[PDB]
Amino acid sequence: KVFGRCELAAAMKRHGLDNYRGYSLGNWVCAAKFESNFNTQATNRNTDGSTDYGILQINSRWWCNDGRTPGSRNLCNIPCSALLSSDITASVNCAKKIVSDGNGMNAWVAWRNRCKGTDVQAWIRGCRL
Ligand SMILES: [Cl-]
Ligand SMILES: [Cl-]
């Protein structure tokens, strides 16, 4: 599913991401936009053979099992395919573990490079939340 901006904001809000670990909703919308263009089915392969999955491009090296990232972990305890669902619950629950691990949203490269220090509230402007 390709989410609309406001639709996704509202889904993330319902799933407890607004202000989660001090990150306002705009940060999460901004990250999703630049990681996946709001497409739950996005995949991208990394140089080391790991793959990033879903709306927030969660990486099989640490977070999910895809059966082809030898020596990787599965810290969210999920198959990576669950991260591609039109229901973002699994992505959101896994993202909460990532953002809690000490590095905050810096785990998401596109967030660090395209959202951090910008006016992220613009991403939820106009939305009925
Ligand atoms: Cl694996
Ligand atoms: Cl933080």
PDB file of C-alpha atoms and ligand atoms in Angstrom:
ATOM      1  CA  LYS A   1       0.000   0.000   0.000  1.00  0.00           C
ATOM      2  CA  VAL A   2       1.218   3.519  -0.766  1.00  0.00           C
ATOM      3  CA  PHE A   3       0.028   5.727   2.102  1.00  0.00           C
ATOM      4  CA  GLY A   4      -1.039   9.327   1.808  1.00  0.00           C
ATOM      5  CA  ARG A   5       0.899  11.661   4.106  1.00  0.00           C
ATOM      6  CA  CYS A   6      -2.044  12.419   6.413  1.00  0.00           C
ATOM      7  CA  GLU A   7      -3.304   8.852   6.370  1.00  0.00           C
ATOM      8  CA  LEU A   8       0.053   7.614   7.555  1.00  0.00           C
ATOM      9  CA  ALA A   9       0.366  10.347  10.206  1.00  0.00           C
ATOM     10  CA  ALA A  10      -2.993   9.257  11.583  1.00  0.00           C
ATOM     11  CA  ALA A  11      -2.048   5.554  11.515  1.00  0.00           C
ATOM     12  CA  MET A  12       1.254   6.283  13.282  1.00  0.00           C
ATOM     13  CA  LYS A  13      -0.513   8.408  15.893  1.00  0.00           C
ATOM     14  CA  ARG A  14      -2.940   5.598  16.636  1.00  0.00           C
ATOM     15  CA  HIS A  15       0.004   3.211  17.096  1.00  0.00           C
ATOM     16  CA  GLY A  16       1.652   5.406  19.765  1.00  0.00           C
ATOM     17  CA  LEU A  17       4.508   7.023  17.737  1.00  0.00           C
ATOM     18  CA  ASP A  18       3.607  10.643  18.442  1.00  0.00           C
ATOM     19  CA  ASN A  19       6.298  11.872  20.873  1.00  0.00           C
ATOM     20  CA  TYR A  20       7.545   8.281  21.310  1.00  0.00           C
ATOM     21  CA  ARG A  21      10.959   8.707  23.033  1.00  0.00           C
ATOM     22  CA  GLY A  22      10.536  12.472  22.417  1.00  0.00           C
ATOM     23  CA  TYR A  23      10.156  12.211  18.605  1.00  0.00           C
ATOM     24  CA  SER A  24       7.169  14.220  17.417  1.00  0.00           C
ATOM     25  CA  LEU A  25       4.971  12.696  14.714  1.00  0.00           C
ATOM     26  CA  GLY A  26       6.466  14.805  11.917  1.00  0.00           C
ATOM     27  CA  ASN A  27       9.833  13.044  12.402  1.00  0.00           C
ATOM     28  CA  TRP A  28       8.274   9.645  11.723  1.00  0.00           C
ATOM     29  CA  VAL A  29       6.312  10.845   8.679  1.00  0.00           C
ATOM     30  CA  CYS A  30       9.443  12.530   7.306  1.00  0.00           C
ATOM     31  CA  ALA A  31      11.515   9.362   7.794  1.00  0.00           C
ATOM     32  CA  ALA A  32       8.882   7.189   6.092  1.00  0.00           C
ATOM     33  CA  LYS A  33       8.705   9.590   3.157  1.00  0.00           C
ATOM     34  CA  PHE A  34      12.447   9.487   2.499  1.00  0.00           C
ATOM     35  CA  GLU A  35      12.972   5.838   3.410  1.00  0.00           C
ATOM     36  CA  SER A  36      10.136   4.313   1.421  1.00  0.00           C
ATOM     37  CA  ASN A  37       8.151   7.069  -0.289  1.00  0.00           C
ATOM     38  CA  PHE A  38       5.324   5.832   1.990  1.00  0.00           C
ATOM     39  CA  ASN A  39       5.214   2.413   0.274  1.00  0.00           C
ATOM     40  CA  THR A  40       4.844  -0.516   2.643  1.00  0.00           C
ATOM     41  CA  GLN A  41       6.257  -2.863  -0.038  1.00  0.00           C
ATOM     42  CA  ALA A  42       9.627  -1.080  -0.476  1.00  0.00           C
ATOM     43  CA  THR A  43      12.724  -3.288  -0.295  1.00  0.00           C
ATOM     44  CA  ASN A  44      16.363  -2.342  -0.819  1.00  0.00           C
ATOM     45  CA  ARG A  45      19.453  -4.541  -0.660  1.00  0.00           C
ATOM     46  CA  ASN A  46      22.538  -3.339   1.245  1.00  0.00           C
ATOM     47  CA  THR A  47      26.164  -3.986   0.157  1.00  0.00           C
ATOM     48  CA  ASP A  48      26.686  -6.474   3.002  1.00  0.00           C
ATOM     49  CA  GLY A  49      23.821  -8.688   1.724  1.00  0.00           C
ATOM     50  CA  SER A  50      21.250  -7.505   4.264  1.00  0.00           C
ATOM     51  CA  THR A  51      17.939  -6.083   3.064  1.00  0.00           C
ATOM     52  CA  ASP A  52      15.785  -3.185   4.277  1.00  0.00           C
ATOM     53  CA  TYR A  53      12.040  -3.799   4.444  1.00  0.00           C
ATOM     54  CA  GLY A  54       8.911  -1.756   4.502  1.00  0.00           C
ATOM     55  CA  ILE A  55       7.730   1.727   5.232  1.00  0.00           C
ATOM     56  CA  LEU A  56      10.644   2.391   7.604  1.00  0.00           C
ATOM     57  CA  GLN A  57      13.261   0.280   5.822  1.00  0.00           C
ATOM     58  CA  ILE A  58      14.064  -1.945   8.762  1.00  0.00           C
ATOM     59  CA  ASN A  59      17.310  -3.891   8.236  1.00  0.00           C
ATOM     60  CA  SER A  60      17.519  -7.722   8.274  1.00  0.00           C
ATOM     61  CA  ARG A  61      21.108  -7.446   9.642  1.00  0.00           C
ATOM     62  CA  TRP A  62      19.661  -6.833  13.152  1.00  0.00           C
ATOM     63  CA  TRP A  63      15.916  -6.609  13.309  1.00  0.00           C
ATOM     64  CA  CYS A  64      14.093  -9.281  11.304  1.00  0.00           C
ATOM     65  CA  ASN A  65      14.632 -12.702   9.774  1.00  0.00           C
ATOM     66  CA  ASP A  66      14.586 -13.044   5.966  1.00  0.00           C
ATOM     67  CA  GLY A  67      16.438 -16.359   5.881  1.00  0.00           C
ATOM     68  CA  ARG A  68      19.302 -15.055   3.736  1.00  0.00           C
ATOM     69  CA  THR A  69      21.320 -12.710   5.967  1.00  0.00           C
ATOM     70  CA  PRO A  70      23.841 -15.197   7.462  1.00  0.00           C
ATOM     71  CA  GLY A  71      24.978 -14.361  10.994  1.00  0.00           C
ATOM     72  CA  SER A  72      22.270 -11.697  11.439  1.00  0.00           C
ATOM     73  CA  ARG A  73      19.992 -11.140  14.398  1.00  0.00           C
ATOM     74  CA  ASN A  74      16.234 -10.979  14.636  1.00  0.00           C
ATOM     75  CA  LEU A  75      15.770  -8.528  17.496  1.00  0.00           C
ATOM     76  CA  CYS A  76      12.114  -7.748  16.615  1.00  0.00           C
ATOM     77  CA  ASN A  77      11.343 -11.473  16.433  1.00  0.00           C
ATOM     78  CA  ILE A  78       9.526 -11.304  13.149  1.00  0.00           C
ATOM     79  CA  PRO A  79       9.948 -12.432   9.561  1.00  0.00           C
ATOM     80  CA  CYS A  80      10.979  -9.430   7.477  1.00  0.00           C
ATOM     81  CA  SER A  81       7.953 -10.077   5.198  1.00  0.00           C
ATOM     82  CA  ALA A  82       5.654  -9.021   8.046  1.00  0.00           C
ATOM     83  CA  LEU A  83       7.194  -5.540   7.597  1.00  0.00           C
ATOM     84  CA  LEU A  84       5.733  -5.293   4.083  1.00  0.00           C
ATOM     85  CA  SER A  85       2.075  -5.573   5.178  1.00  0.00           C
ATOM     86  CA  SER A  86      -0.440  -2.770   4.475  1.00  0.00           C
ATOM     87  CA  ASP A  87      -1.037  -2.840   8.261  1.00  0.00           C
ATOM     88  CA  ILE A  88       1.920  -0.998   9.748  1.00  0.00           C
ATOM     89  CA  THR A  89       1.586  -2.511  13.247  1.00  0.00           C
ATOM     90  CA  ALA A  90       4.653  -4.751  12.913  1.00  0.00           C
ATOM     91  CA  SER A  91       6.781  -1.957  11.435  1.00  0.00           C
ATOM     92  CA  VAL A  92       5.759   0.426  14.197  1.00  0.00           C
ATOM     93  CA  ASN A  93       6.339  -2.066  17.007  1.00  0.00           C
ATOM     94  CA  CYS A  94       9.792  -2.882  15.630  1.00  0.00           C
ATOM     95  CA  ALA A  95      10.648   0.796  15.120  1.00  0.00           C
ATOM     96  CA  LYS A  96       9.881   1.410  18.812  1.00  0.00           C
ATOM     97  CA  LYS A  97      12.545  -1.138  19.740  1.00  0.00           C
ATOM     98  CA  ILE A  98      15.051   0.414  17.329  1.00  0.00           C
ATOM     99  CA  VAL A  99      14.510   4.002  18.477  1.00  0.00           C
ATOM    100  CA  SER A 100      14.832   2.805  22.106  1.00  0.00           C
ATOM    101  CA  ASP A 101      18.205   1.154  21.597  1.00  0.00           C
ATOM    102  CA  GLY A 102      20.303   4.259  22.381  1.00  0.00           C
ATOM    103  CA  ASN A 103      20.794   5.932  18.962  1.00  0.00           C
ATOM    104  CA  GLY A 104      17.301   7.364  18.653  1.00  0.00           C
ATOM    105  CA  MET A 105      16.192   8.108  15.119  1.00  0.00           C
ATOM    106  CA  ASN A 106      19.829   8.350  13.913  1.00  0.00           C
ATOM    107  CA  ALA A 107      19.371   4.635  13.054  1.00  0.00           C
ATOM    108  CA  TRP A 108      17.500   5.893   9.959  1.00  0.00           C
ATOM    109  CA  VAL A 109      20.043   7.397   7.581  1.00  0.00           C
ATOM    110  CA  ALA A 110      17.394   9.320   5.640  1.00  0.00           C
ATOM    111  CA  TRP A 111      16.109  10.780   8.890  1.00  0.00           C
ATOM    112  CA  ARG A 112      19.562  11.953   9.930  1.00  0.00           C
ATOM    113  CA  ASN A 113      20.255  13.372   6.467  1.00  0.00           C
ATOM    114  CA  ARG A 114      16.864  14.793   5.395  1.00  0.00           C
ATOM    115  CA  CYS A 115      14.671  15.303   8.481  1.00  0.00           C
ATOM    116  CA  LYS A 116      16.872  16.007  11.500  1.00  0.00           C
ATOM    117  CA  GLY A 117      17.062  19.739  12.246  1.00  0.00           C
ATOM    118  CA  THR A 118      14.360  20.602   9.688  1.00  0.00           C
ATOM    119  CA  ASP A 119      10.841  21.807  10.346  1.00  0.00           C
ATOM    120  CA  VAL A 120       9.304  18.333  10.627  1.00  0.00           C
ATOM    121  CA  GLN A 121       5.932  19.669  11.825  1.00  0.00           C
ATOM    122  CA  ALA A 122       5.379  20.617   8.147  1.00  0.00           C
ATOM    123  CA  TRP A 123       4.858  16.915   7.372  1.00  0.00           C
ATOM    124  CA  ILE A 124       1.678  16.798   9.474  1.00  0.00           C
ATOM    125  CA  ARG A 125       0.385  20.295   8.557  1.00  0.00           C
ATOM    126  CA  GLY A 126      -3.223  20.262   7.372  1.00  0.00           C
ATOM    127  CA  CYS A 127      -3.872  16.714   8.658  1.00  0.00           C
ATOM    128  CA  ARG A 128      -6.900  15.763  10.726  1.00  0.00           C
ATOM    129  CA  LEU A 129      -5.257  13.560  13.290  1.00  0.00           C
TER     130      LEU A 129
HETATM  131 CL    CL B   1      19.110 -15.121   8.075  1.00  0.00          CL
HETATM  132 CL    CL B   2      16.965  10.372  21.377  1.00  0.00          CL
END
